[PDB]
From a paper:
Bacterial type I signal peptidases (SPases) are membrane-anchored serine proteases that process the signal peptides of proteins exported via the Sec and Tat secretion systems. The type I signal peptidases (SPases) process the majority of proteins secreted by bacteria. They belong to a group of serine proteases that utilize a Ser–Lys catalytic dyad, which differs from the classical Ser–His–Asp triad found in most serine proteases and in the eukaryotic endoplasmic reticulum signal peptidase complex. The human pathogen Staphylococcus aureus has only one active type I signal peptidase, SpsB. Here, the crystal structure of SpsB, the type I signal peptidase from the Gram-positive pathogen Staphylococcus aureus, is reported, and a peptide-tethering strategy that exploits the use of carrier-driven crystallization is described.
S. aureus SpsB was expressed, purified and crystallized as an MBP fusion protein in which the N-terminal MBP was joined by a three-residue linker to the extracellular domain of SpsB (residues 26–191). In the uncomplexed structure the catalytic Ser36 of SpsB was mutated to Ala, but this mutation has no effect on the structure of the SpsB moiety, which is essentially identical (r.m.s.d. of <0.2 Å over 153 aligned Cα atoms) in the SpsB–peptide structures described later, in which residue 36 is restored to the catalytically active Ser. There are some differences in the catalytic domain (SpsB residues 26–84 and 138–191), where SpsB lacks one prominent β-hairpin loop and a C-terminal helix that are present in LepB, but the major differences are in the second, noncatalytic domain (residues 85–137) in SpsB. This domain is much more divergent and has little sequence or structural homology, with only a small three-stranded β-sheet in common between SpsB and LepB. The structure of SpsB, the first from a Gram-positive bacterium and the second SPase I to be crystallized, shows that the Gram-positive SpsB and the Gram-negative LepB have a conserved fold despite their limited sequence identity (23%). There is little change in the peptide-binding cleft between the uncomplexed and peptide-bound SpsB structures. In the uncomplexed structure Tyr30 partially occupies the S3 pocket but moves when peptides bind, and Val76, which forms a bridge between the S1 and S3 pockets, adopts an alternative rotamer. These changes are consistent with changes observed between the apo and inhibitor-bound structures of E. coli LepB, with the homologous residues in SpsB adopting the same positions as in LepB.
Author numbering: 12 to 407, 409 to 421, 423 to 526
The structure:
Amino acid sequence: MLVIWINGDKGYNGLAQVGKKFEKDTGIKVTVEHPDKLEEKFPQVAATGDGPDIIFWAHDRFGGYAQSGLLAEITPDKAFQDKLYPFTWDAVRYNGKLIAYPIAVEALSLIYNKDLLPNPPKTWEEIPALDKELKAKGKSALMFNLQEPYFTWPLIAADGGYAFKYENGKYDIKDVGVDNAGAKAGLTFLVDLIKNKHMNADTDYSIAEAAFNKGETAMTINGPWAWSNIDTSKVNYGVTVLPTFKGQPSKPFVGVLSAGINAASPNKELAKEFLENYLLTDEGLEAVNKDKPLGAVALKSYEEELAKDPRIAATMENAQKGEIMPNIPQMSAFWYAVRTAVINAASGRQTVDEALKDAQTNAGAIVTPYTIKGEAMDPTLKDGERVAVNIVGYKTGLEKGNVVVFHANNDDYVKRVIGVPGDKVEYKNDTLYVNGKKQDEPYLNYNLKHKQGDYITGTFQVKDLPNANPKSNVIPKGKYLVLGDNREVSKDSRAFGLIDEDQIVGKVSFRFW
Ligand SMILES: OC[C@H]1O[C@H](O[C@H]2[C@H](O)[C@@H](O)[C@@H](O)O[C@@H]2CO)[C@H](O)[C@@H](O)[C@@H]1O
């Protein structure tokens, strides 16, 4: 059996027909599935080893999967490589290696109802007036999915703005383009459409799709996969170039639908045969495309056959003014960061400026999975517990209460920051005094109530500790007091003294409250 995952918006029935052919020829069963959140679930089920043999997604997520060792390197021969456009192979190259088979090029277009709107607008700026005109006639101008930053980026980034800077053949993770003048202008325009009742912040994919396909709204923004359902609605639609904002073309991300092979699959050779000899042929792509259109397919023979379609021409025109999605592992963080900014800006939970400031920071912030070792933070953090570590740069925002990972010599420890540079700190029995006054420690509540002896921390003062000023209990510059929540068993600053700023490598996020 080959198990294949593909997103619910794609032609999974058509893909299944190709599966039936393969079964008929080989005796091997092919099961196509379209679970929710498959792009998040894939690494989860790979960790167990009950994942799909083949996973379809846009190329952006595959860098992250490869970096985690979840994907097999693919080994097409010259003759097969030559069948696909070289730029499609570029999209599935990660650290020198091919990690997926490219299937098709996707970009969003403006889709409009010709009976409601014979002349689609050239500019985003026209849409408010157009909506007023249509509101008078019982309709609206535009509905598209506002929940996913894929759909809102074309406007957001039209006037400037990018994910990661690409230069001299590689992405710079340190150069994020979310908090800049262009994106502020675009996101502000988007928020103002909502503010002014031209769109609704709750509008998602199914709401927008239903509304356009029942003739309630004049325009939507979607990809080629959406065309089949519009064909079935008998709406008279056109697919055209996205409007300009401030005279600048919209900047959709360009995705390449790609198929990766699970590194843990026991059917890698069969997966290769299915993709190369059954799917990526004129016959196989037609089956999927007839179910839900693929876009500009990676296979030259069949792309040439479909290129006559004005809707494909429109797709690629929008793609020419777009931004190829980066495939670096950090893209996941970028998407989540931008998703949050738009929702918060659109709901008013943040101003556009707060939204983009945070998103700029979070898109570039490196987060590393970590597993807790031992009992010294028990029960706050348990042995074996999975946490997230936000890597802190050299001399870059630590506060009391932060739980941190730090080094000394191959040694790493997890402890809580109890005092930072400048803090006066001391313990009398189990009572913590910080800058003269008592500080509560709710994270010790359990261990205080279940203590073996008289006291779990016990009396001490900063002055008496290694690396402190013997003169004062005021923590010196660039130094930190760190203690384990499991005070009865923790080897911490009470044993090895104050630690240095340069020792701290990350801040720990974990399950709490
Ligand atoms: O919204 C963030 C999301 O964008 C892209 O996902 C697209 C996908 O490429 C399209 O094929 C279509 O299915 O819509 C998706 C957006 O809902 C990225 O490929 C994805 O990783 C990212 O989370």
